[model samples]
Target: LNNYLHVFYYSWYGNPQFDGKYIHWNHPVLEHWDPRIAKNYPQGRHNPPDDIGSSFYPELGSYSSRDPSVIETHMRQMRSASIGVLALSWYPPDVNDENGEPTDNLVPTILDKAHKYNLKVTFHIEPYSNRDDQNMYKNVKYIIDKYGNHPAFYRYKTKTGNALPMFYVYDSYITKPEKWANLLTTSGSRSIRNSPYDGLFIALLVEEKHKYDILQSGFDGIYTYFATNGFTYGSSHQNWASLKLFCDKYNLIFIPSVGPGYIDTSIRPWNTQNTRNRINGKYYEIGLSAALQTRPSLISITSFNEWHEGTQIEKAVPKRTSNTVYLDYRPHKPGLYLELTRKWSEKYSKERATYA
Candidate 1:
């Protein structure tokens, strides 16, 4: 796990005007009264800034991840940024978000594209409807049987010389540690250990207490998913050093997630206080520095293109429609974040490799 960099990747995007599919066009959680807000779309998909949806306008304008072109381009960008693994957000087959159709079918295409760039895809297990230990066991088996053989599927080697797939359990705190222990613990009655579904399971650490729960649950590691600097006890950068110490004590992996910035008020208008200014690339650099200083085996980025949370490092162009204005990465360039990621990744790789 030397210098391993993982990015949270989203494969849910659609063009209702073109594909008749709406991918997060109307966010379920973000509700703003302003008509110009991202919740209101191009309505009909006209041209550039105008009718498009999304609180932040993408450089690609409106794209459908179902498109091979978009997937390939994203793979190239991520590879260029030295992203070795993609924590691909996934829902159960035939299940998806209210505003978006099922996207599990796109995994194959994304995996192929990622493979072309020497990247690996790890499942980010989302607690869709009724995710429990029993169902998660079945789902793990399903994913392994279905896509495990793919060369692009991520494999993590353990101290015991076993190579296994990795899954990041999102919002894992919802389920009790007792329930998770059943599947994750080796001695549990219904354990996935030594079974075909055996693999590395990572749980999200939101609160400080969640760390102990995650460790007791038999998870291999813990990660912070939110990108905001001070959004939560885990999200805040100041606490990473202590977190690393905890991981070291418990012999668990500490994956600190960094982000370029955060601003979702365009959708969650009431949550304005959580917004963090990017300050050009300074804020991101600071995060990278903080994360690297911890000297963890692996690091994760908050997101590659989570537009709703405004933590995306993807390219975005400045735009103004008839009613709305979209923010973008200026003063530097459209690809500044990617460039920064690549730059620091190389540095981190060099130092970490030497340390190892």
Candidate 2:
């Protein structure tokens, strides 16, 4: 019933059985930016069904996102974990990330499946080519017009008692604050302030200075999305109190994100430094405790199933391939993270109930 516990979701995965070709399952190995570093890492694409790009294997094996069964399973898992909302990664109709094809058409199924499980869906807009204020307005309008009426569409109630659609804009800093202000601010000519499409736009916070820029751009809130704690100023749990303080002064919402762990070595082989072990779930518990201390308006899990980043809380079975032995919960069940999430969600709700 509590919609404050949200998790990031991805729908770009695919397999040959469903899409005729593997989509994100066979993630292309990325070369290091530095020439010296490039030589140290292997470069090629992952061969799926046996060897995928993720450090851990799914309990469901390699799955296609378009599969109705898969979506149903995912929703069931989230509900069991006490997750009420999923922040779906999205882009424009024809646009997608470098490794994925467009998945905009799949939103309908996701919404329907989520609704069945009593889950809500929100958009976590990814950066697309030439993203600007003008195009953003058009895209938001398009989405609201198409899916706004869906029973599963998520709406957050603000202090003003207005329940408006909420969108998490990833890499919001890429476009200058001026550009965002043009659409977010009330006085701007292209502003969506009083328009039908007006909603709570949450910006991704990375650097320390982004807080000021995010407010100037008229964003309603901030969310620290990276699973790696110290990876960015916002992602670091130590700075969350200060960040919340800043948001409080501006009457902005601060949503702190937590994760089971982080390990993208399977995709970015050279980035082992960011790896954070799950430590049999202690890592995640600590994150939850820290997030609760801030008493944020919402608490978002870094992911529900982002296999590429090894931050998923979805069930994952112990696995072994010819050349690699995938990571697993070990000495613990595959649903350990899910169970932990449920426990934390209950605790969070109880604490929230006591808030004045």
Candidate 3:
């Protein structure tokens, strides 16, 4: 059996105020009292009682606290498990630390290491608003000029020639697609905004006909986020049928997204009202099944590690007390969740290969 595994890797350097400290890579301790000298401290005055440093500083205890190192290990594990490709999340040029330096180091490191395993790589460029159009173009040009021809780079193309990678502009609904189209055209890049690369693009069922018009104008094929909660939201049976009808009418390729479930309440607790799906093995199995059934030329998993929103497939630590499930919890043991994901991915890969 033969199957293609496409894994996406995402890492946030840190908040702009933090100077890009590798906050998420290590555990931190916010001491209640100054540890320099022993002194009694008030409960909530000098040091807050609820100031748990580790919660905010995930990288405090980590061996290699650098963002690049964290991603290196993840890629190593995925390669060992026979995963085929990776789509690393990238931001525009100006999205950087307070110093105004670009954060593209992670991408190069991935290319350097991934080549050893012959794994293909692509960029999922997160779109920033056009408040600074010149800065955006400079950053885009830098990336394309430097790594556009790397051996590991994955480019979207048609019968014409090489095309840009599948760059995702999230919240595209709010932005004017015309400006985006003009930007790409002026950048001297072939526009696949709404067509297909190699004659294929995955389409999600929720976005209406107008979405396709924008995609056609800028991208080659369609790539869509299919699952929102545990159940299919926009790309369900009825919605998918209608989406397919329109795609056929426009001759567009539809690329489908597969995600187990989502939960990002930790960062923004109030946004929890929309989270209904529980992420588990069953969720993954179903997502894999749906992607295989779609028979699209390419498939993309929602994420490999999105820890902030807690949509991670990584293993969680068992409750401290077996008798009680709610109160005391510990950090998830490293390698446990990675191993579990590898096993499940292997199983799904075999299943998909049979159908392919």
Best by TM-score: 2
Q: How do the predictions measure up, each by TM-score?
A: 0.92, 0.98, 0.66
Candidate 1 residue runs with Cα over 4 Å from true position: 1-3, 28-53
Candidate 1 positional error at 234, Å: 0.7
**Candidate 2 has which clashing residue pairs, if any?**
none
lDDT, model 1: 0.83
Q: Could you arrange the candidates by lDDT from highest to lowest? A: 2, 1, 3
TM-score of 1: 0.92
What is candidate 1's lDDT per residue for 116-189, written digit by digit as tens? 88899999998788898888988899899889999899998766788889899999999999999999999987
Best by lDDT: 2
Lowest lDDT 10-residue stretch of candidate 1: 40-49
Give the Cα lDDT of each candidate. Answer: 0.83, 0.93, 0.48
Model 3 / residue 35 / CA error / Å = 35
